[PDB]
């Protein structure tokens, strides 16, 4: 059971209500129950925000809540810093972790609408000009013409209808260059296609943290985090990105699911820093991408009030639990059960449209054949 705000009280503080709370940490707490011999209730925080000693100053939410006395043990994913360290104690962390940045995964989006472009249209026309002219020129070089067009047409196209052959010696030498021209032309086409298929898709356009587009913000890229989070502490203690830091205050939030759906609706381009949650978000959503280098090596452990008699004991269990691998069992229980495609940004194409264009060319040539054929019928 879970005594929490009815409408979650983000402004209209509907009174509390028993809900159902359950997850990894709950498992942890019940283990610590079986090993520590205590009983308890459970409740939510007043605000939906971790807390910080903002301006006299005072800590929002759970921090100040514990500090008062109305609380006596704080178990949740909790970061570690110096500020919180100044007042309370907490044992070794139970899950090491860091920071990363997530972006709405892009689609491969093959580009083959060049189905006749990658040389030119100008080339596509001058080649037909050249074929006609060299055809009739070979004809004159003979002295088998009305169909000699078939000859060069096919030898470009590798048809093999070959109704005849040049009887004169002149063209009987000439045709070689035409053959080589066809060979090198198709070679060229293949080569430029292969090259044009090297243009990669730069996804993690931000390099770790030193990317200036994210080291100096551009209006083309939107970005934020959750307000009053420890991440803000980390930034404002590192004055460098202050601008971006200042900049990001134009976009901050109050909940993680906020930024979650924000990047889901493709407006917000990046969410951050809840790494050990971004993993589940990704491997259960498979429309998002993590990246960056790990920023702030820290760990989630359990905090308790100042110098309670419990500290010395708690740690023990944890290591005991880290000994028998029970931790890893909980991992397999609540962690690995999410999976989607994870190979890489794979290059491929099955483009129905870029070949549907040429299939329509097929169908059009069909009616062209009907028309021209009956034209020749009436002719003969």
């Amino acid at each position: 059971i879970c005594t929490g705000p009815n409408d979650t009280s983000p402004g209209s503080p509907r009174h509390t209500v028993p809900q159902c709370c359950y997850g990894f940490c709950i498992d942890l707490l019940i283990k610590l129950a079986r090993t520590m011999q205590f009983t308890y209730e459970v409740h939510l925080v007043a605000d939906g925000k971790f807390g910080t000693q903002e301006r006299k100053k005072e800590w929002n939410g759970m921090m100040g809540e514990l500090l008062s006395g109305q609380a006596d043990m704080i178990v949740a994913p909790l970061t570690i810093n110096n500020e919180r360290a100044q007042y309370i104690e907490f044992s070794k962390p139970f899950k090491y972790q860091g920071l990363t940045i997530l972006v709405k995964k892009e689609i491969p989006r093959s580009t083959l609408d060049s189905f006749m472009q990658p040389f030119q249209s100008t080339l596509w026309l001058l080649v037909g000009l050249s074929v006609h002219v060299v055809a009739v020129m070979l004809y004159l070089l003979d002295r088998t013409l009305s169909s000699a067009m078939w000859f060069s047409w096919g030898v470009l196209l590798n048809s093999g209808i070959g109704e005849g052959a040049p009887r004169s010696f002149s063209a009987r030498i000439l045709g070689m260059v035409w053959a080589g021209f066809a060979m090198i032309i198709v070679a060229s086409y293949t080569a430029n296609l292969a090259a044009f298929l090297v243009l990669d898709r730069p996804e993690e356009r931000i390099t770790g943290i030193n990317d200036p587009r994210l080291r100096n913000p551009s209006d083309k890229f939107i970005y934020a985090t959750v307000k009053q989070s420890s991440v803000d502490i980390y930034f404002r203690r590192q004055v460098e990105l202050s601008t971006m830091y200042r900049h990001m205050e134009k976009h901050n939030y109050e909940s993680a699911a906020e930024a979650i759906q924000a990047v889901r609706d493709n407006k917000l381009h990046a969410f951050i820093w809840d790494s050990a949650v971004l993993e589940f978000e990704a491997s259960q959503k498979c429309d998002l991408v993590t990246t960056g280098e790990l920023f702030f090596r820290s760990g989630f452990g359990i905090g308790m009030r100042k110098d309670s008699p419990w500290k010395q004991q708690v740690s023990l269990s944890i290591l005991k639990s880290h000994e028998n691998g029970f931790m890893e069992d909980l991992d397999k229980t609540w962690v690995r059960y999410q999976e989607c495609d994870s190979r890489s940004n794979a290059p491929a194409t099955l483009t129905c449209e870029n070949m549907a264009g040429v299939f329509m060319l097929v169908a059009g040539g069909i009616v062209a054949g009907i028309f021209l054929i009956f034209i020749e019928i009436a002719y003969k």
């Binding site: 070089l141 002149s170 260059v177 021209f181």
Partner: peptide, 29 residues
């Protein structure tokens, strides 16, 4: 650089015209 240059086909029609000229020259015989 997707579409090739018309100029970026020099040797093509170079050899084309060369063959045409050699053809006429020999066909004189």
């Amino acid at each position: 650089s997707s579409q090739l240059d018309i100029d970026n086909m020099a040797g093509v029609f170079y050899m084309l015209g060369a063959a045409m000229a050699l053809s006429l020259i020999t066909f004189i015989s």
